[PDB]
Amino acid sequence: KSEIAHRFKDLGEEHFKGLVLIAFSQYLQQCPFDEHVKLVNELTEFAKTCVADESHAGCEKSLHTLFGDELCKVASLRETYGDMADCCEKQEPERNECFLSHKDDSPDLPKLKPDPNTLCDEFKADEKKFWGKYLYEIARRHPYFYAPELLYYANKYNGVFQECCQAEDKGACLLPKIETMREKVLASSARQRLRCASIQKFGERALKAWSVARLSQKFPKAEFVEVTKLVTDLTKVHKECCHGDLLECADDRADLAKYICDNQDTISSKLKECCDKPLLEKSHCIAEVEKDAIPENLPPLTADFAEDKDVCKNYQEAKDAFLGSFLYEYSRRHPEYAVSVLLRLAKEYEATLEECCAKDDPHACYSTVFDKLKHLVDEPQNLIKQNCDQFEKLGEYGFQNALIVRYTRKVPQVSTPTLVEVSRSLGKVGTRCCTKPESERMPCTEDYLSLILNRLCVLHEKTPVSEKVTKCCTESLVNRRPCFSALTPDETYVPKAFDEKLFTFHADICTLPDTEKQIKKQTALVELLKHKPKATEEQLKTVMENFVAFVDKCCAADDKEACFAVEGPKLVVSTQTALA
Amino acid sequence: HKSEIAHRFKDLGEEHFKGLVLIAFSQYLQQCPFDEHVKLVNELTEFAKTCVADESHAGCEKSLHTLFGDELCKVASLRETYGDMADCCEKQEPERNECFLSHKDDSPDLPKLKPDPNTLCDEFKADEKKFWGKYLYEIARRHPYFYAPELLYYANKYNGVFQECCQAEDKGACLLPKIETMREKVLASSARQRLRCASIQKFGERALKAWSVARLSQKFPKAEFVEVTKLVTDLTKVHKECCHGDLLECADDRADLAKYICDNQDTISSKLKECCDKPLLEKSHCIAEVEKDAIPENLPPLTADFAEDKDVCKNYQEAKDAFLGSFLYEYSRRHPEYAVSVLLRLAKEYEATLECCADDPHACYSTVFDKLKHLVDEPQNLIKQNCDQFEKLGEYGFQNALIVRYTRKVPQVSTPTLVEVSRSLGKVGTRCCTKPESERMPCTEDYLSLILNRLCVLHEKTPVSEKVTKCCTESLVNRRPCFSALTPDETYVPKAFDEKLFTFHADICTLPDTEKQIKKQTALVELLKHKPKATEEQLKTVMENFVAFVDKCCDKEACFAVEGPKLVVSTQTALA
Numbered sequence A: 001k002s003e004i005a006h007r008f009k010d011l012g013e014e015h016f017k018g019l020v021l022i023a024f025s026q027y028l029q030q031c032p033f034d035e036h037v038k039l040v041n042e043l044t045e046f047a048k049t050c051v052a053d054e055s056h057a058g059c060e061k062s063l064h065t066l067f068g069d070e071l072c073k074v075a076s077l078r079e080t081y082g083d084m085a086d087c088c089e090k091q092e093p094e095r096n097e098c099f100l101s102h103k104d105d106s107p108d109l110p111k112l113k114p115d116p117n118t119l120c121d122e123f124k125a126d127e128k129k130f131w132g133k134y135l136y137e138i139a140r141r142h143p144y145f146y147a148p149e150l151l152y153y154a155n156k157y158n159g160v161f162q163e164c165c166q167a168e169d170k171g172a173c174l175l176p177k178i179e180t181m182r183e184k185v186l187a188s189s190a191r192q193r194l195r196c197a198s199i200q201k202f203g204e205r206a207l208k209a210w211s212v213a214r215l216s217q218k219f220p221k222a223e224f225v226e227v228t229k230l231v232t233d234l235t236k237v238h239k240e241c242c243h244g245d246l247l248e249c250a251d252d253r254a255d256l257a258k259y260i261c262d263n264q265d266t267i268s269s270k271l272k273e274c275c276d277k278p279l280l281e282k283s284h285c286i287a288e289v290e291k292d293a294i295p296e297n298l299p300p301l302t303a304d305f306a307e308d309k310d311v312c313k314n315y316q317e318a319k320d321a322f323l324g325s326f327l328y329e330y331s332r333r334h335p336e337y338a339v340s341v342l343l344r345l346a347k348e349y350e351a352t353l354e355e356c357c358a359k360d361d362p363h364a365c366y367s368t369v370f371d372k373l374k375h376l377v378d379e380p381q382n383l384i385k386q387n388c389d390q391f392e393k394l395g396e397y398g399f400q401n402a403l404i405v406r407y408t409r410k411v412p413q414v415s416t417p418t419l420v421e422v423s424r425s426l427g428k429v430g431t432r433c434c435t436k437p438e439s440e441r442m443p444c445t446e447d448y449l450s451l452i453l454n455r456l457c458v459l460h461e462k463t464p465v466s467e468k469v470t471k472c473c474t475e476s477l478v479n480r481r482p483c484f485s486a487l488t489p490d491e492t493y494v495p496k497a498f499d500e501k502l503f504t505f506h507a508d509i510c511t512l513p514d515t516e517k518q519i520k521k522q523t524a525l526v527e528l529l530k531h532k533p534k535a536t537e538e539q540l541k542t543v544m545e546n547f548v549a550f551v552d553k554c555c556a557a558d559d560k561e562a563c564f565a566v567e568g569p570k571l572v573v574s575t576q577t578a579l580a
Numbered sequence B: 001h002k003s004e005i006a007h008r009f010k011d012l013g014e015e016h017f018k019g020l021v022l023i024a025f026s027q028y029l030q031q032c033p034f035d036e037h038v039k040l041v042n043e044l045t046e047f048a049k050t051c052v053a054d055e056s057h058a059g060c061e062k063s064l065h066t067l068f069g070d071e072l073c074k075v076a077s078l079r080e081t082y083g084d085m086a087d088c089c090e091k092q093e094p095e096r097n098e099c100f101l102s103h104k105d106d107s108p109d110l111p112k113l114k115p116d117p118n119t120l121c122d123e124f125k126a127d128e129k130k131f132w133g134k135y136l137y138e139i140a141r142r143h144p145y146f147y148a149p150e151l152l153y154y155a156n157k158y159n160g161v162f163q164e165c166c167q168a169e170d171k172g173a174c175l176l177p178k179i180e181t182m183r184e185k186v187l188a189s190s191a192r193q194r195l196r197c198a199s200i201q202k203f204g205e206r207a208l209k210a211w212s213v214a215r216l217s218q219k220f221p222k223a224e225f226v227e228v229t230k231l232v233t234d235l236t237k238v239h240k241e242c243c244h245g246d247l248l249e250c251a252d253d254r255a256d257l258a259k260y261i262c263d264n265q266d267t268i269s270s271k272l273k274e275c276c277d278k279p280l281l282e283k284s285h286c287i288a289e290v291e292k293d294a295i296p297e298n299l300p301p302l303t304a305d306f307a308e309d310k311d312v313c314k315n316y317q318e319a320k321d322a323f324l325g326s327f328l329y330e331y332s333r334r335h336p337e338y339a340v341s342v343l344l345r346l347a348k349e350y351e352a353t354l355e356c357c358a359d360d361p362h363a364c365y366s367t368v369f370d371k372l373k374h375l376v377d378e379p380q381n382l383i384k385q386n387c388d389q390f391e392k393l394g395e396y397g398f399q400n401a402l403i404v405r406y407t408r409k410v411p412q413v414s415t416p417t418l419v420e421v422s423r424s425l426g427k428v429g430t431r432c433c434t435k436p437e438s439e440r441m442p443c444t445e446d447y448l449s450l451i452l453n454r455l456c457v458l459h460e461k462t463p464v465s466e467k468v469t470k471c472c473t474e475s476l477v478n479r480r481p482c483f484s485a486l487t488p489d490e491t492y493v494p495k496a497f498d499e500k501l502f503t504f505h506a507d508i509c510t511l512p513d514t515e516k517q518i519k520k521q522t523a524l525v526e527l528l529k530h531k532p533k534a535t536e537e538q539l540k541t542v543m544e545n546f547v548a549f550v551d552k553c554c555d556k557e558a559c560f561a562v563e564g565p566k567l568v569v570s571t572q573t574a575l576a
């Protein structure tokens, strides 16, 4: 009768406290760590009270009710967060959707530069708080981070500091490990955000479809009804995470991990290795598991979904069940496809049935449906065949630079900091993907774009300025990459007026770290194309060069500032000659 | 009435009271977080209020050290953070406080602070006072001997720069110049107070007293010696109290002195009226840096009263310090141009000379006045050679020259001290050498005593060189000559070669400009430790070849990676 007692019992105090802490850090992103801790314990103490006495006053409230009551006691709330304190005026579930809406997906908080020595002492100073501070720093930065998975990563973090803090040159031991891990974490955020976006913007069934695709690939051996059960459970888990119900999300995720291990036979043979780890490690392992072998001799899809005479009758009888079935069959025997394409394929199959089952001889129309699809599979490979195999010549950094011009021309109205962050990430696919077996590029890249493109839609949808982008993001989820790739620059676009401040540079530029410097450098490329929408392709190879030669002189010459002072106006006036 | 904490709370009013208390904690517990110290200021501030209501309430009669220290001893994280410092709680006052003082870090190795005008302007308008307190905290924790009342004043100026400049468009361009100039005034100010503190601690009260007789007699040459004696004792008490952590009383006593001074401008100075009409902190600041009043018209020659006279040794033996002060009084009022360091040096000899009045005293001590003014003319050459030295090389080149000279003198000294010191010396070139040549000698004499003190104070903790200890401990007045006299000593056995010292990374390119120099000057230091007898011409070849390294590389990882080992072996061939 007490949701909070139940969750404290099911998860135990340590995890309970971490999740609860993750919750605050994700709602109240600009609040300080020591405060949120203050808020975690009393809620923990309170939870202890209702497990002792479950009929005590208030332990029968929902966790949203109880958690939200805490947020609404935050002294600095309207002062720190403003309009968010309006949320406190509402009733559940409205209060919580209001709070959710104020989650900053671009909290513009300070990048964490880790000094191995100053960190390792804190680690040994206090382990558990070290772990907590980790949960906090990542969650505030990714307000939709998959919670139980964040706990897993905090654990992994300590072990890296646990086992690399007894060294001489710690720093040489650490940085590589923590750089690799934070890459995994970035990805993990991007995925969960996509799962969140599908639900909010395309409804539950969009995410179900996605889950069907993923699981049917990994467990091609399992029966469709088995796969369905995993889908609803897993969807509920994500629906819960994406709504802030972290304790319930975590608890349910654990319950799902068990069911899966308890039923390996009907599901997969590659499970035997995961289902023998501790809970967090187990679930991560299950999520990353290798796909099982496809079953032996199976009827072609054409049989049950095209040639058969009763498809419209079967489809009309239970549309979603029937479509899920199609997605099941298609995916289990095609691990090579990206789940993104599979959805694209099923979305198509649905539209034709809608069309054809309405015509006079519906079977005449649909019999050919596998002729339209078998093309949708071919469309993507080419768009992989011109680029990563474009990519080798330019290399990565060059490639990103190639992309900024292309996308900026596509959608110039987009905020610069967005184009930069995005454009960078698209280029990073090559190092990410195109090194892979040429066979598995397509799932990898189509799967990464769906992540990067989502990031774009989520940044844009708040401060919306470009209709083409709204169109591509909003129209469909499966077709976002096609909608965006299909984009062309509009001669309607009126070029951005010149602002010296954009093209002016200071000694700070040299005193920058290597990467951020690129962004500060890449930002300017962005501004030019906004300024000169119809610029050409080779002067850029010269205009950047005078620039790369510019920064070197100044970073070289003695008076670190003076060159910038006199050199700087020169490049603009030269490059402003070359503007035509 | 019988409660010191009531007494100070009434005398200063709550706002100064709270800042000063925060300064104290911030100076004792330098590595503790700002909000923690805040919690401690209030608890003590509420308690303080209780004793003004009821002065007979329990504990209101305890000393401030009892009360402040009892608070230091409730900190849960004290031994974990500070180690032996938690031993201090086991002691009784006054031993507990002398123990806490001993753990004050003069080199707290805290993060250099880069102010981002947006982030700061956000904080400032957000909350004025916590912004104000946070300044007090960051400065105090970095200078645990900072002159407290003066620190409050600077907090005020900090906020005023933010009342302005933040209501602006390009905030950063309005701000950065202002906070940067002030950051110099504060740094200087710290070095001074660190000096006044060290004089007392290591040379006693009268040492601090002699300076003051000089400093004040210059400023108020109109005042009679007795008035000055009155000011001197008052002011010495002020600094003794600050230097001992007795901040509330320091502030309270300083104010009272500022008041007294305004009430007697007539008997003291004509240049006071512009100060004596400001708010309290500003007033005190202004009085301190006020312009020297004009010397009165025609007064007796010095030779007259201190030599030709028949009772010079006998009057002297009757009251040594008083008579010696009179000398310091009289000599100083008529030499506004001289450096206080020089006047003490002069007084120090005259004392050394006075110690000859021991068969026919009148005969020996008649020639003393030609000996002194030799001491004034002595310094002048090392100012031309250094200022002409500096003029040629520029600052940065000059600092590098200094780094080499001193690394030669005292190789055992820690690398970071040598670097920190030489730099500040080089800035003397820019600080003084620009002035009209007539007045170059005093200004240069004045900053050195500050910088040289900073060396003794850093070394005095982890003492590794017999040479500096001798000079730091010998005398306060003669520290400047002492150091000049030492020459690199063949006793020194060169430091074994360590590649870790001379390897370079891409960070060297990405550094702010200031650290950039420090990493190189650091590298330069370590070389002379390795090769003491390198020559005055090879090094510029090593530096020429060296700056001819970063230019190529500044890969980014691979060249440094191979270039660096190449340069190491180059400098290692031509090293002889």
Ligand SMILES: C[C@@H](C(=O)O)c1cccc(C(=O)c2ccccc2)c1
Residues within 6 Å of the ligand: A214, A234, A237, A238, A253, A254, A256, A257, A260, A282, A283, A284, A286, A287
């Ligand atoms: C999104 C991620 C997850 O939310 O964990 C995922 C992806 C693919 C398969 C599974 C899965 O089957 C699973 C179920 C229970 C616990 C762990 C993994 C999970």
Ligand SMILES: C[C@@H](C(=O)O)c1cccc(C(=O)c2ccccc2)c1
Residues within 6 Å of the ligand: B215, B235, B238, B254, B255, B257, B258, B261, B283, B284, B285, B287, B288, B289
């Ligand atoms: C050390 C500094 C100071 O302690 O402020 C200083 C220098 C010179 C003169 C005075 C002074 O006479 C004074 C007295 C009362 C309040 C303010 C200044 C003070």
Ligand SMILES: [Ca+2]
Residues within 6 Å of the ligand: A106, A107, A108
């Ligand atoms: Ca933002």
Ligand SMILES: [Ca+2]
Residues within 6 Å of the ligand: A248
């Ligand atoms: Ca429920």
Ligand SMILES: [Ca+2]
Residues within 6 Å of the ligand: B107, B108, B109
């Ligand atoms: Ca130190």
Ligand SMILES: [Ca+2]
Residues within 6 Å of the ligand: B241, B246, B249
């Ligand atoms: Ca006292």
